[PDB]
Design a protein around this ligand. Structure first.
Ligand code: CLA
Ligand code: CLA
Ligand code: CLA
Ligand code: CLA
Ligand code: BCR
Ligand code: BCR
Ligand code: LMT
Ligand code: HTG
Lengths: 57, 122
């Protein structure tokens, strides 16, 4: 069979499933961005942009 | 032209103090020999400001706006007391009784809730 480092080559001649895989990657990246923003909002302290701005946190 | 409870109920007007027309720019004479009282004192708050708690003592803290979250339950009303004429012609209101307190919760930017007993007791 295919070795483990080649499993995704099944997409090379399958444009529709390539689009599907690219869609899933895009979904994962967009979900990371939303998740990351929510985590930061749950931890960010906005009370002092002078001595505790976002880049200290 | 006089409103009933059923005219007012649920409108929010019950939390509002009476107003006077723009024509009411007169003068009410005080007879230093007469005794007076305030038959009704009403206080309708429109803004609640909270002083921020700063980390820097060199920094002068300011009063910031807040959001009222306990609805139209804030006004003081039906307050009465003596209105004394003092020897120097000044007047002193001495509060006696009435609905002279309201618990109020306002919310600061970021979510911190500030309860207070808004009052003119005594
Ligand atoms: C963008 C991400 C992505 C996408 C769109 C695909 C898409 C595909 N994979 Mg690939 N794969 C991926 C990442 C991805 N893969 C990763 C990270 C691995 C290593 C684990 C693999 C290993 C792999 C194998 C062995 C095979 C495929 C196969 C395929 C095809 C069929 C679907 C399948 O069987 O997946 C398999 C399902 C997964 C790999 C699920 C991965 C789950 C991750 C690792 C953890 C997620 C758990 C949870 C949500 C998060 C954990 C958080 C933690 C704190 C607990 C399809 C083209 C198959 C194929 O067609 O071969 C010819 C196949 O046999 N993939
Ligand atoms: C746009 C980026 C991109 C895309 C779409 C591909 C796509 C592909 N690669 Mg290439 N490659 C890339 C960048 C990319 N690569 C980079 C940056 C490197 C150096 C790191 C390589 C080095 C490389 C080698 C040496 C090989 C491929 C191979 C392949 C083919 C099979 C992949 C597979 O089945 O893996 C399956 C992978 C797994 C089942 C698990 C891998 C788990 C990794 C090691 C750790 C987990 C990563 C994590 C889940 C995601 C974080 C990613 C993010 C931080 C970027 C497929 C055409 C293979 C090929 O040519 O087949 C003929 C092959 O041998 N790639
Ligand atoms: C004018 C026509 C047209 C348009 C607008 C696009 C636009 C796009 N194509 Mg391309 N493509 C075209 C013609 C077109 N293509 C043709 C004729 C072919 C040969 C078949 C291809 C082959 C092709 C491949 C193989 C791939 C793309 C991909 C992409 C997307 C990459 C960016 C992305 O995913 O952002 C993120 C997405 C958004 C911000 C949301 C977009 C909202 C969508 C467009 C609306 C959905 C409704 C719509 C009717 C669905 C079909 C749209 C379709 C016309 C693209 C982008 C949406 C890639 C892709 O889909 O990655 C996931 C991809 O892998 N295209
Ligand atoms: C420019 C931006 C960019 C690019 C070019 C890529 C490219 C890729 N990503 Mg995506 N990713 C991105 C941004 C990007 N990513 C962002 C912002 C997020 C949110 C965090 C993700 C989340 C993400 C997930 C969850 C997955 C991918 C995967 C992939 C690979 C799919 C194709 C493949 O089969 O490779 C084959 C794999 C390789 C060629 C190896 C890549 C090696 C990378 C570059 C470094 C890994 C180093 C080290 C081994 C990781 C250890 C991590 C461990 C400590 C947890 C491709 C390399 C998928 C993948 O890797 O499937 C196997 C996958 O599952 N990405
Ligand atoms: C379905 C649906 C829905 C939902 C959705 C959701 C809910 C989503 C989510 C999503 C999400 C929530 C996502 C997330 C993602 C994440 C990710 C993707 C991550 C990744 C990571 C990584 C990749 C990492 C790596 C690393 C490590 C781990 C260590 C260090 C180093 C590094 C960085 C490499 C709705 C309702 C809208 C409607 C429609 C349908
Ligand atoms: C239609 C319909 C349906 C549908 C469904 C669906 C569509 C689902 C989907 C689902 C999904 C799609 C889900 C998701 C999942 C996700 C996950 C599981 C995630 C994870 C993540 C994480 C873990 C993260 C982490 C982090 C980051 C990334 C950054 C920041 C930090 C933290 C740590 C937070 C149902 C069946 C209901 C029913 C019938 C109808
Ligand atoms: C889209 C669907 C998924 C949505 C779910 C993800 C939501 C993430 C939202 C992040 C913003 C909420 O962030 C949350 O805010 C409040 C107020 O500061 C914090 O709450 C903290 O402070 C308040 C102060 O009143 C305390 O009463 C409370 O006990 C304490 O936990 C949480 O520790 C923080 O995590
Ligand atoms: C996608 C919807 C995410 C849910 C949003 C939660 C309310 S928003 C949230 O409110 C907290 C309390 O006022 C603040 O302390 C915090 O800074 C703010 O991010």
């Amino acid at each position: 069979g295919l070795p483990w480092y080649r499993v995704h080559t099944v997409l090379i001649n399958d444009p529709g499933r390539l689009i599907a895989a690219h869609l899933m990657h895009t979904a994962l990246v967009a979900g990371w961005a939303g998740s990351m923003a929510l985590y930061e909002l749950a931890t960010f302290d906005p009370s002092d942009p002078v001595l505790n701005p976002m880049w200290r946190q | 032209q006089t409103l009933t409870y059923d005219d007012i109920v649920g409108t929010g007007l019950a939390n509002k103090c009476p107003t006077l027309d723009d024509t009411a720019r007169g003068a009410y004479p005080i007879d230093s020999s007469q005794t007076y009282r305030i038959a009704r004192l009403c206080l309708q708050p429109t803004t609640f400001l909270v002083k921020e708690e700063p980390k820097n003592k060199r920094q002068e803290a300011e009063f910031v706006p807040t959001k009222l979250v306990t609805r139209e339950t804030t006004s003081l009303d039906q307050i009465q007391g003596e209105l004394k004429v003092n020897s120097d012609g000044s007047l002193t209101f001495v509060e006696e009784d009435g609905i002279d307190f309201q618990p109020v919760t306002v919310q600061m930017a970021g979510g911190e809730r500030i309860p207070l007993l808004f009052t003119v007791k005594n």
